[PDB]
Amino acid sequence: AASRPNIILVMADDLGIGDPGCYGNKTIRTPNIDRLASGGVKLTQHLAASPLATPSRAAFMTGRYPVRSGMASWSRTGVFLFTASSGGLPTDEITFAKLLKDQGYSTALIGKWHLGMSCHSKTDFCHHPLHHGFNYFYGISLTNLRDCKPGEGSVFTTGFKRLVFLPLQIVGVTLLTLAALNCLGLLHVPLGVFFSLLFLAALILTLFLGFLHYFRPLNCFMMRNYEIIQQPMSYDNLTQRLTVEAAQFIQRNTETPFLLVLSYLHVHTALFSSKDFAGKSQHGVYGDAVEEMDWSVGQILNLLDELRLANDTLIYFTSDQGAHVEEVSSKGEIHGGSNGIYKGGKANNWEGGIRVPGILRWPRVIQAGQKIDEPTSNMDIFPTVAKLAGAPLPEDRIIDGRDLMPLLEGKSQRSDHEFLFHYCNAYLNAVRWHPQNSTSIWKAFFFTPNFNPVCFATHVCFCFGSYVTHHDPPLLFDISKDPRERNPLTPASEPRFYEILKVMQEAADRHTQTLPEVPDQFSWNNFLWKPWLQLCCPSTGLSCQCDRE
Numbered sequence: 001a002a003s004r005p006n007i008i009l010v011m012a013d014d015l016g017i018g019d020p021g022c023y024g025n026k027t028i029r030t031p032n033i034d035r036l037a038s039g040g041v042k043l044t045q046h047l048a049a050s051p052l053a054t055p056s057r058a059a060f061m062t063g064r065y066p067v068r069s070g071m072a073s074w075s076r077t078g079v080f081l082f083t084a085s086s087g088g089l090p091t092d093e094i095t096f097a098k099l100l101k102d103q104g105y106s107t108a109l110i111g112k113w114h115l116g117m118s119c120h121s122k123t124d125f126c127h128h129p130l131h132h133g134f135n136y137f138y139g140i141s142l143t144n145l146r147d148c149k150p151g152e153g154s155v156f157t158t159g160f161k162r163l164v165f166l167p168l169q170i171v172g173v174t175l176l177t178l179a180a181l182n183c184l185g186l187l188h189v190p191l192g193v194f195f196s197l198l199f200l201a202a203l204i205l206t207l208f209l210g211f212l213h214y215f216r217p218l219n220c221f222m223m224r225n226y227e228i229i230q231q232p233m234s235y236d237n238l239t240q241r242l243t244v245e246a247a248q249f250i251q252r253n254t255e256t257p258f259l260l261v262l263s264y265l266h267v268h269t270a271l272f273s274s275k276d277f278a279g280k281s282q283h284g285v286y287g288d289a290v291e292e293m294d295w296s297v298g299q300i301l302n303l304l305d306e307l308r309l310a311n312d313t314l315i316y317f318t319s320d321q322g323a324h325v326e327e328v329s330s331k332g333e334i335h336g337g338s339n340g341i342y343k344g345g346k347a348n349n350w351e352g353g354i355r356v357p358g359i360l361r362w363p364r365v366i367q368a369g370q371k372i373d374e375p376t377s378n379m380d381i382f383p384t385v386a387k388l389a390g391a392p393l394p395e396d397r398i399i400d401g402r403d404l405m406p407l408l409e410g411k412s413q414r415s416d417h418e419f420l421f422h423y424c425n426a427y428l429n430a431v432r433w434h435p436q437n438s439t440s441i442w443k444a445f446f447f448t449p450n451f452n453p454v455c456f457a458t459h460v461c462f463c464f465g466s467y468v469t470h471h472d473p474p475l476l477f478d479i480s481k482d483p484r485e486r487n488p489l490t491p492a493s494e495p496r497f498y499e500i501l502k503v504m505q506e507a508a509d510r511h512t513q514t515l516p517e518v519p520d521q522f523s524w525n526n527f528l529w530k531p532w533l534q535l536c537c538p539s540t541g542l543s544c545q546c547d548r549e
């Protein structure tokens, strides 16, 4: 409360809840992170506001549901894939960084943003971290992907199939058959038609070739504030370079309260390690990466000790969302991570994607070794940190996040989340319910995905319909009793079935009455590659090579 301690927010990319040591895993080496759970609280029911990178991060930064800022899509694209697109965290939203920055904190973002860059001009940076509360930024505007490192890139495959291969095949077959018929004297085919097919194939093929050659350079680069330092992004000691920038930040603020947000690229698809982690792993390169990530955390702790700030510094650890279930290469390699006993993962509202690692450590205040089980949200630190810094919560808008200091200081035993909603981009998927006078977790599902190999089909389940199956009355679970979420409830729990789904179903109805009309930050105009938005470090246009790193 107006304490003004140092705040370190550490967010791992896609790290499953069932991967760290302090959570069940027995083979992975996540020491420094366990050396953070034993020193404080371990959230056992930490819920990310979304299964995708962009919206989850959007919710974290704002403490508001992705829909309030219109940072969730209705299409199959739930995250930004082009640095040169105009969609981003709304210029009118307020991040906890801006909040802390106004109270005089030194703010820094090290690593991944994934909330847009510019709007109308390549340099307006309307959505850049420096126009959302951060004084300093070292990292990447978009996100790490297979395509950022030559060896895979099956991120676009589904589209490559529908947009290039298949039509390339229709044209091809059409031309081969037209040639046979014409050659057989069953049809006269004018040169003008063969020309039209060749032309169309050349065009589709050139665009596809263009895409393959430029995607990586135009979308995978390193930045330092408003400038490109490395294009394309190199993996030479990436996790190490983030740490140094993080470490260097803390150090230049040993006497000023500071806010550090370390958003690692790990362990998002396209794993990697330094010379020091390559090989020794559990379930492959992923483990090699996760364990490298942990070495980074530890590196920051020892610095906190070295500088004697560890005692008056709030540290938090989490993952933007669950580990990727359907993430396996072609030559075999099984990536993605694990979410333990839980069902689902990255891209669906099944615990495995909603649930997630949540750790808090503040020596001077939080009782080390503690363990909370009440339902907590990804959006909860926005209000928690605002208080810590004495920054006032915004009153012109609603905040879904709930301060969690009373829960971590034992001043309270129940979290203010008896009604949590689970969206799937713009689509209101599930709905949780921790009844006031009970310890049961009622979870309804207005719909559910449709796991591909009975969702390796499209690489990621959706929220649309052609891959979604609605329910009426709403399907219902009781994660409190059945966490594994491997058995719907209707027989025994039938004495209050229609009863509960009446109190829950109303929530959504009364809830959706606070969802204002806001622009779709994920519309086609805000998601598509805009040439005039492309940052190109060397020359002008598209031939951007950079490495000031």
Ligand SMILES: CCCCCCCCO[C@@H]1O[C@H](CO)[C@@H](O)[C@H](O)[C@H]1O
Pocket (backbone or CB within 6 Å): 120, 121, 122, 124, 532, 533
């Ligand atoms: C006050 C901030 C205004 C930001 C928007 C500025 C729009 C005009 O700015 C111009 O936009 C062109 C198209 O993107 C660019 O090619 C020019 O280099 C840029 O100067």
Ligand SMILES: CCCCCCCCO[C@@H]1O[C@H](CO)[C@@H](O)[C@H](O)[C@H]1O
Pocket (backbone or CB within 6 Å): 167, 170, 171, 174, 193, 196, 197, 200
């Ligand atoms: C974007 C991909 C579109 C694929 C559609 C291909 C339709 C076939 O192509 C069309 O075939 C006609 C007769 O064979 C020709 O007269 C047309 O000029 C030709 O464009």
Ligand SMILES: *[C@@H]1O[C@H](CO)[C@@H](O)[C@H](O)[C@H]1NC(C)=O
Pocket (backbone or CB within 6 Å): 018, 019, 023, 024, 025, 026, 027, 028, 282, 283, 286, 287, 337, 338, 340
């Ligand atoms: C530990 O992690 C590996 C992959 O990193 C995974 O295969 C294993 O299942 C995890 N252990 C648990 C808790 O299931």
Ligand SMILES: *[C@@H]1O[C@H](CO)[C@@H](O)[C@H](O)[C@H]1NC(C)=O
Pocket (backbone or CB within 6 Å): 236, 237, 240, 274, 275
């Ligand atoms: C560490 O990063 C530096 C960057 O200059 C590089 O020279 C070195 O080889 C890296 N360590 C590795 C991967 O051996």
Ligand SMILES: [Ca+2]
Pocket (backbone or CB within 6 Å): 013, 014, 052, 053, 268, 320, 321
């Ligand atoms: Ca992610």
